[PDB]
RNA sequence: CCCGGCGAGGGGAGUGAAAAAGAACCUGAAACCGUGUACGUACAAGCAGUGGGAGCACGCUUAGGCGUGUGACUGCGUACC
RNA sequence: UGUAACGGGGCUAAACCAUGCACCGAAGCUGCGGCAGCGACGCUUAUGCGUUGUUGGGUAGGGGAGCGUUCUGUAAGCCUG
């Protein structure tokens, strides 16, 4: 419902959302840089 | 009859009853306009004065067009840099029509 | 005032017909359908059948007088097409388009 | 600002002719250029010409001073593949006298389509051939 | 869930295609060149606002040079004499008396010929 | 071979405008009846240019 | 009932709030060409646009002095990922 | 391959060398309209006004913060033949 209640702010980051273009910070590599398994599937290196 | 007057950095020539472009009036359409900033006046001989403005000289006018023009968009980009920039602009206009020239 | 005649789904593409339907435009009420007494190709018969309907059926379908009757519009458009395939070795497909047209004629008392 | 428009009610053509008889080709070209461009008068001129109409009537009697009369040559690529012709002033004016004025003045005019819109209004004659006799040209002597 | 993209991707096409029509061929509606009729057109409009600020400035110089040369002096020397004479100048757009009042402009070039030593 | 999109109607009509050269000659009246006929061709009465050609 | 080959497919009267609601029947935009009409288009070399504009057409309006649509022609101009 | 080793003309000075004063010369300098940030000086603490000073093209990556879209709740409401 919420409606008549005052909301709370600054207690969630807003958020996991990924960059859509470099005018908003990050673009075509999403902050992981270019190529290698380190850019596709986790940290890209074993134990 | 014609006159020449000052407004800041720019100097304007105008004739009796004529319309002329001015810089934006803050009072819009709501008041009449007058100038004592007149620095040359002629009706049959085009005499120049070197002294600062005509003593007791007056130009009177009415506002005939005022407002903020059509909205436009212009854009900036760079070759293979994958961003896009956009500026909005409108600009203000003001035109005034002479009602008197007095000396 | 106005009378309409049509023929839909005709066995011709519209460009076979339109050459003649464009030629007969801009002619006097003494020359219209009198320039179409002797005709060239099936293309011209498809117009003749519909024009001889419009310029004569208004005598029952609009009013008793047709003795100053004029053609206001005389045009043709390409209708729905039917897709068909033909034999080629190591098939693979090879098609043709079986075309149709829609003929329109309009006449007016003014 | 805007206060003038070139059209036949504001720019009347009145027809002038430069006397070429014994005139120096270069001094004649510096006059013909500015008078085909419209530049001798109080005018306003955009990407157009504000002319008066000007022609040449006795071109086969034009002169060159000192040397370059029988020395140096003018070149043209004929348009028949790599074909080229060359002639000196006193042996070129003997054959093609109306070309001598064209090749002398064309480089004193603007480039491209504006330079072409000026050049299309120029006609050159030899033997005193009076072919604008109804336009009654006013003579200029330099 | 599926993105219908009518309010977004298609709107981002229409925002450009709206500025089409009125052209001498394909750019009136062919999207992949009607885009160039906004983007390349804007690089031409920046050049219009630059050239009407750089190259049309010469109309305040070259027109006045020819008129001063009828009095036998060139612009580069005429202006230095008119600086030495004091007053009657502010902005180069105000010099069109070289066409509108050639008698009073002649006296102003002659003033520079009485101050250039 | 190459052809970009579609031929312009401004050039296609300019190539149709000499393709058949179809003209109006209003036809000539028959030499035995009050009605018009096709040049050097038989009439509906089986006649041509003042003489009988076929039986009815 | 009118037209034609007792066609093909329309139309007139008529059913209906609707027949762009007709069995080929919800509402309906695009590519593609099509009917009318206004201005434009007749020698002139490259991303067909950007700016300027003679001429023409449309609608108001006249003490300090029209705008719109359309536009020969010309200054400027080698796309996108 | 054809104007073709100033791009080309003009030019026996209009070339070559250096000299003296002028002028033309960016999106910047500089003036103004507007905005965000940093900080003073004058007046005042809805919190602003006045003036002066100053920074603002930013990609791999590191931080800050809006507008739409859809579902769920509001919705026993609000708009609607």
Swiss-Prot record, chain A:
Residues spanning the signal sequence: none
Stretches for region Disordered: 1-47
Biased composition (Gly residues): 20-30
Top-level taxonomic group: Bacteria
Bilayer-crossing regions: none
Disulfide bonds: none
Family, similarity comment: Belongs to the universal ribosomal protein uL15 family.
Functional note: This protein binds the 5S rRNA. It is required for the late stages of subunit assembly, and is essential for 5S rRNA assembly onto the ribosome.
Subunit (UniProt): Part of the 50S ribosomal subunit. Contacts the 5S rRNA.
Protein name in the entry: Large ribosomal subunit protein uL15
Name of the gene: rplO
Range covered out of full length: 2 to 48 of 144
Swiss-Prot record, chain B:
Swiss-Prot/TrEMBL keywords: Ribonucleoprotein, Ribosomal protein, RNA-binding, rRNA-binding
Record's keyword annotation contains Methyltransferase: no
Entry superkingdom: Bacteria
GO molecular function: rRNA binding; structural constituent of ribosome
PROSITE patterns membership: RIBOSOMAL_L21
Signal peptide: none
GO BP, one annotated term: cytoplasmic translation
InterPro entries, per database record: bL21-like, bL21-like_sf, Ribosomal_bL21, Ribosomal_bL21_CS
One cellular component (GO) term of this entry: cytoplasm
Subunit composition and interactions: Part of the 50S ribosomal subunit. Contacts protein L20.
Function (record text): This protein binds to 23S rRNA in the presence of protein L20.
Family named by the database record: Belongs to the bacterial ribosomal protein bL21 family.
Name used for this protein in its record: Large ribosomal subunit protein bL21
Organism whose genome encodes this protein: Escherichia coli (strain K12)
Species lineage: Bacteria, Pseudomonadati, Pseudomonadota, Gammaproteobacteria, Enterobacterales
Gene this chain is encoded by: rplU
Swiss-Prot record, chain D:
SUPFAM superfamilies (alphabetical): Ribosomal protein L13 (SSF52161)
Keyword annotations of the record: Ribonucleoprotein, Ribosomal protein
GO biological process, any: negative regulation of translation
GO annotations of cellular component type: cytoplasm; cytosol; cytosolic large ribosomal subunit; ribosome
PROSITE patterns, A to Z: RIBOSOMAL_L13
Pfam families, sorted: Ribosomal_L13
Superkingdom of the source species: Bacteria
Record GO terms (molecular function): large ribosomal subunit rRNA binding; mRNA 5'-UTR binding; mRNA binding; structural constituent of ribosome; zinc ion binding
Coiled-coil boundaries: none
The UniProt record lists the keyword Ribonucleoprotein: yes
Gene3D superfamilies: Ribosomal protein L13
Family from the record: Belongs to the universal ribosomal protein uL13 family.
Subunit structure: Part of the 50S ribosomal subunit.
NCBIfam families (alphabetical): rplM_bact
Function statement: This protein is one of the early assembly proteins of the 50S ribosomal subunit, although it is not seen to bind rRNA by itself. It is important during the early stages of 50S assembly.
Protein known as: Large ribosomal subunit protein uL13
Species this protein is from: Escherichia coli (strain K12)
Gene: rplM
UniProtKB/Swiss-Prot annotation, chain E:
GO cellular component: cytoplasm; cytosol; cytosolic large ribosomal subunit
Lipid biosynthesis as UniProt keyword: no
InterPro entries per the UniProt record, alphabetical: Ribosomal_bL20, RIBOSOMAL_L20_CS, Ribosomal_protein_bL20_C
One matching Pfam family: Ribosomal_L20
GO biological process: cytoplasmic translation; ribosomal large subunit assembly
Superkingdom of this protein's organism: Bacteria
Keywords for this protein: Ribonucleoprotein, Ribosomal protein, RNA-binding, rRNA-binding
Subunit structure: Part of the 50S ribosomal subunit. Contacts L21.
UniProt family annotation: Belongs to the bacterial ribosomal protein bL20 family.
Protein name, as recorded: Large ribosomal subunit protein bL20
